[PDB]
């Protein structure tokens, strides 16, 4: 039976796992549902075949609650929606070494390439690897072929989590593609035709191993950082001015092959993510599935606009025939900044309010009010008083025939003062 780890990550920052999220895992077989706190390495569980569901009961301060993940365990494998689980990672994260071999020398034209990146395989050998982010820091310098590494000044030793390169789109900063799967194919085929191993046959006449590696790396950038393969535009671009014309031409051949319709011959590649977000993620040239186990990966959204707002409803009844102890009812529909219904709990000065598919219902009598709290920037409301029968209705002193009002793009606190009038 199947090993899984439940790991909580923050969208956009994978340098460590996101701790203190309250998580619940639910199934439907003979399996005991359980609650736990997301932690720095993952939650290890051994599971029988069946269908399970991970739910976030709530999130660390400053994060949205994520959508529940449903997955199925079958015959030692994990499936989700239907595909086979793409998240395969090592058990001790940020434990793999990668380094830039600071003492290796070989030029592009006039100047040492010096982007000689490697990750250490479990058995001690070194695989060639390539940067995925052209502006972040390279793997730590080693002066002795990867046996010792310069630490980072602030976070210390920089090590990496080894994952299967699937779903690599999210680590790109400025990619050309918009389809994740298309993107992945592009990447695997660049690697397919580029430099992978010491002493391999260089299909391209007159290039050194190092010049191919440079070509390969620039091709990756084409796709990951939208690098323009043009000698003019490259003059000052991370040392690629020193790239001669034929070496550049190969880089083009790699991009053009990858863009073509052939399936990738590579099924899978190692990928590495560093424990410092200013450093670059690395795409490997080899594939080592022995160490990788299934991860149920849930990604929490950083709360992007820390500013939140209040919305107050009031009821006042007037005229000689107005029932001051009638409960008037209000249907409230909220949509967020990006035009999406709110399926979440909401805080008030009284008891809390669950919103189901953008909606919720409250009531008030003459003199009662209710303040909603902590609604996002750019939110919009639609609010209706549902039982106005008999009463002339004004909202913020405006006659409102169908007892309904709306407002989009709200950048501050807002008030809806309903008047219910009934004269005899």
Author numbering: 290 to 319, 322 to 372, 377 to 719
Reported in the publication:
In M1 Group A Streptococcus (GAS) strain SF370, pili are comprised of three subunits, Spy0125 (minor tip pilin, also known as “Cpa”), Spy0128 (major pilin), and Spy0130 (minor basal pilin). Most of these pilin domains contain stabilizing intramolecular isopeptide bonds (in Spy0125 these are between Asp595 and Lys297 and between Asn715 and Lys610 of the middle and bottom domains, respectively). Intriguingly, the Spy0125-CTR structure revealed that this top domain contains an internal thioester bond between the side chains of Cys426 and Gln57510. Therefore, the internal thioester in Spy0125 may mediate direct attachment to a host cell factor to promote bacterial adhesion during infection.
To establish whether there are any minor conformational differences between the native and internal thioester variant proteins that could cause the reduction in adhesion (rather than just the loss of the internal thioester), we determined the crystal structure of the Spy0125-CTRCys426Ala variant. The structure shows that the overall fold of the variant is essentially identical to that of the native protein in the P212121 crystal form. The root mean square deviation (rmsd) between the Cα atoms of chain A of the Spy0125-CTRCys426Ala structure and chain B of the native is 0.65 Å. The Spy0125-CTRCys426Ala structure displays the same overall secondary structural elements, with slight differences only apparent in flexible loop regions. The electron density defining the position of Ala426 and Gln575 shows no link between these side chains, as expected. A small reorientation of the side chain of Gln575 results in a new hydrogen bond between the Gln575NE2 atom and the carbonyl O of Asn428. Tyr516, that is in close proximity to the internal thioester in the native structure is located in the same orientation, but no longer forms any hydrogen bonding interaction with these residues. The structure reveals that the only consequence of the Cys426Ala mutation on the protein is the removal of the internal thioester. There are no significant rearrangements in the overall protein fold that can explain the ∼75% loss of bacterial binding previously observed in the adhesion assay. Showing that the overall CD spectrum, proteolytic/thermal stability, and crystal structure of Spy0125-CTRCys426Ala are similar to wild-type protein provides additional, albeit indirect, evidence that the internal thioester has another function—most likely in mediating adhesion.
